[PDB]
Amino acid sequence: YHTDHMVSIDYAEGRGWHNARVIPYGPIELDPSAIVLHYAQEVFEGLKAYRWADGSIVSFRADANAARLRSSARRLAIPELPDAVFIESLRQLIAVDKAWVPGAGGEEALYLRPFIFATEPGLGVRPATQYRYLLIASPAGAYFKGGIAPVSVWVSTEYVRACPGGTGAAKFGGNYAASLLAQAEAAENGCDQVVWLDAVERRYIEEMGGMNIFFVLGSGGSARLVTPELSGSLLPGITRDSLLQLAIDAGFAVEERRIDIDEWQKKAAAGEITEVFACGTAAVITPVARVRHGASEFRIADGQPGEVTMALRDTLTGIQRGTFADTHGWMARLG
Amino acid sequence: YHTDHMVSIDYAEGRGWHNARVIPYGPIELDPSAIVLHYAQEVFEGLKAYRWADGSIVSFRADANAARLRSSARRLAIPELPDAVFIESLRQLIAVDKAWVPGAGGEEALYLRPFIFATEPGLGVRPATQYRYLLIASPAGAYFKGGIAPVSVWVSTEYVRACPGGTGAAKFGGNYAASLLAQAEAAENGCDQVVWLDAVERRYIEEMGGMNIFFVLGSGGSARLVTPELSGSLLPGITRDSLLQLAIDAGFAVEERRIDIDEWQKKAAAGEITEVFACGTAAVITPVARVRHGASEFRIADGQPGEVTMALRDTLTGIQRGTFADTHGWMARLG
Ligand SMILES: Cc1ncc(COP(=O)(O)O)c(CN)c1O
Ligand SMILES: Cc1ncc(COP(=O)(O)O)c(CN)c1O
Secondary structure, X not given: OOOOEEEEEEEEOOXXXXXXXXXXXXXXXXXXXXXXXXXXXXXXXXXEEEEOOOOOEEEEOHHHHHHHHHHHHHHOOOOOOOHHHHHHHXXXXXXXXXXXXXXXXXXXXXXEEEEEEEOOOOOOOOOOOEEEEEEEEEEEOOOOHHHOOOEEEEEOOOOOOOOOOOOOOOOEHHHHHOOHHHHHHXXXXXXXXXXXXXXXXXXXXXXXXXXXXXXXXXXXXXXXXXXXXXXXXXXXXXXXXXXXHHHHHHOOEEEEEOOEHHHHHHHHHOOOEEEEEEEEOOOEEEEEEEEEEOOEEEEOOOOOOOHHHHHHHHHHHHHHHOOOOOOOOOEEEOO | OOOOEEEEEEEEOOOEEEEEEEEEOOOEEEOOOOOHHHHOOEEEOOEEEEEOOOOXXXXXXXXXXXXXXXXXXXXXXXXXXXXXXXXXXXXXXXXXXXHHOOOOOOOOEEEEEEEEEEOOOOOOOOOOOEEEEEEEEEEEOOOOXXXXXXXXXXXXXXXXXXXXXXXXXXXXXXXXXXXXXXXXXXXXXXXXXXXXXXXXXXXXXXXXXXXXEEEEEOOHHHOEEEEEOOOOOOOOOHHHHXXXXXXXXXXXXXXXXXXXXXXXXXXXXXXXXXXXXXXXXXXXXXXXXXXXXXXXXXXXXXXXXXXXXXXXXXXXXXXXXXXXXXXXXXXXXXX
C-alpha cells in the first residue's frame, strides 16, 4: 500500500549527497554485488504526516528523526544525510502525494519511511562509497480500535537482539533481522509482541521488537513512571522522549533506570506496578495486559488499559492532531 | 571483477525454491519496500573453485558450505535452500564460466559467493515469504605474496560484533555491518585486521572480522594448537574445522577452549605462545605478527611466520591443489 511517488538521493564519495529527485514509486536496480545485499549496510527511520482539521499537513518531531538517521548512519559507517536534506525530502514527497494523507483527526496518518542502503558493488568487507536514500509512504492507522486494545507479550529468554558495544542504539536493519526468530516463538505461545532482555546479564528489560516500554508504579497523584534507561543497546525512541516530557508536564515523577524481569513480575503481582504500556510511532501507546515469561503468565492489574496510559495517550495524540497546544514546538508544517 | 554469468533461484511460499536458471550477470530489480532493504533479512556463503593440473575444476568441502547456508538461514528465519540445490548451482555456474577459473596450482582460484536475500515487499517486520538466491563468481588470489605476509591486528575494546543469543554463529550480513566502524579505528592505528572480544565479559577472544584465530603454544613435538571454542557468537569456520583435523593428522594436541586477551598478551610475552595465525577461505592461513591492545603493542615471537603455521598451510593448500592425498574426502569435482 504505497503512494504514487518516492524521493531518491544518491551518494558518491566525490559528490556527497546529490541528484535529489522525486520520481514514480517503482522497482529499483542494484548490482548483484551491491554491499547491502551481502553486508547489510543500511539504516532507516519511521515517522508520520498528519492531516489537520484546517487542511494543513504536519510532522511530529521530524527534526528528531533527521538527527537519529544521522546517528544510526554514523554507527553503521554511512555518510550522514544532512538534516535539511532529510526535512526537504519530506516536503517534496508531501507536495506531490498529499492526497494520500488520510482525513483528520483520528488514528489515521501517512507513514513515512526514509531509508539508506549501500549500493556500491564489490565483495570487499568495508564501508561503501556509494549509497542511495529513498523516501516512501504508506497510509496507516485504519482498523486501529482506537489504539487501545491491550496486547500480550513474550519475554525472550533464548534470543538476544543487540548488545552493549553493538548496534542496538541505531535504527539498523540487522537488529530487526536478529529478532525474527523470537517473534515466531511469541506467536506459537499466542503472544502479540516480544520483550527483549539485556545481553550481558539476561535480566534487564530493554524494549519490544518495535516499541519502547513504560511501567506505571502506584496510582493517583502518587503515580510514577519508570522506563529502561538508555543502555546503549535499546533504541532512543522519539515517542519515549516525548512521553517523559508529557509526564513531567502532568506532574508525574519519572525514572529512567534499569529494571529487571524479576522486579516487573514481583511488583505486578504485589500491585505496585499498576500499568504497563509500549510506545512508538505507529501505535503511539499500546497497553500491555499480560506477560509470558518462560512457563509463567502474569496479568497487569485487571488486564485493562490503565488510567495514566490512556491519559498520556490522549495528550500526545491531541498535540499530534492539533487539538491540544504544542508547548514544546514538536509540530511543523509539511504542506 | 565478476564472471559472465550468475545462477538465480526464487522462493515463494506456495512453490518453495523454484525457477533455478543461469543468466548473464547484470543488475537485478527490487521493490523499494523489499524486506532486505529495511530489515536486512539475508545470509551468504563463500567458497572457491580450484583448477587442477589435469584440467578438472574442484570444490573444497562445498557440502559444509551448503549446510552452513541452511544453518544461517534457519537463524535468520529464511527457508533453507536444500544442499543438493546449493551444490547443483555451483556445477551449473562452473559449466558456463569455467574459463574464468584461474590456472593451477598456486594461490589463484575462483571465489564463489552464494547468497540469499528477502525480496517480499511490505514494511511489516516479519520473515519474508519471497526470497531470491544468487550465485556469483570473482577471480581471486593474485598478488598474494604466497599468502605468507604477516598481519598486525587491532583488539576491539569499544565495539562488539555479536553476542550470545544473537546471530554470530550465522554467516549473516548484519554481523559484518556491525563491524565496519571498528575496522576504521584499526586502520587509523596502522592495523590490518580486527580481533573481536566476547560480548558478556569483554575479554575472551572470538575471531577476526573475516577469519578464525589459532594460537600455537610451545614448539617441536611439544607444540599445541588452541583456538576459541564455539561460543555461539563466532563463526564455525570450515577452514578452522579442517585445520583441527590436519593438526590431529600431524600428531599435534588441539584444544577448543576459551582464551582471553590477558592470557594471549601474557603468554606471548613469556614465549609460551610461539605463533598466532588467522584462517579462512580467501587467504587459507595468514600469520599474525603484532597485536595492538589499547595503548600497548606486542609482537608474536620474531614477527615472522611460524613453523606450525606454515606446515599446516602447506598441507591444506596441497590437498586443495591435488598435490597431497585427500584422506577425509574434502575434494569434489565441479567440472
Ligand atoms: C526497536 C524499536 N524500539 C523502539 C521504537 C520506538 O521508536 P519511536 O518512538 O521513535 O517510533 C522503535 C520504532 N522505531 C523500534 O523499532
Ligand atoms: C566472521 C568470519 N569468521 C570466520 C570466517 C572463516 O570461515 P571459513 O573458514 O569458512 O571461510 C569467516 C569467513 N567466512 C568470517 O566471515
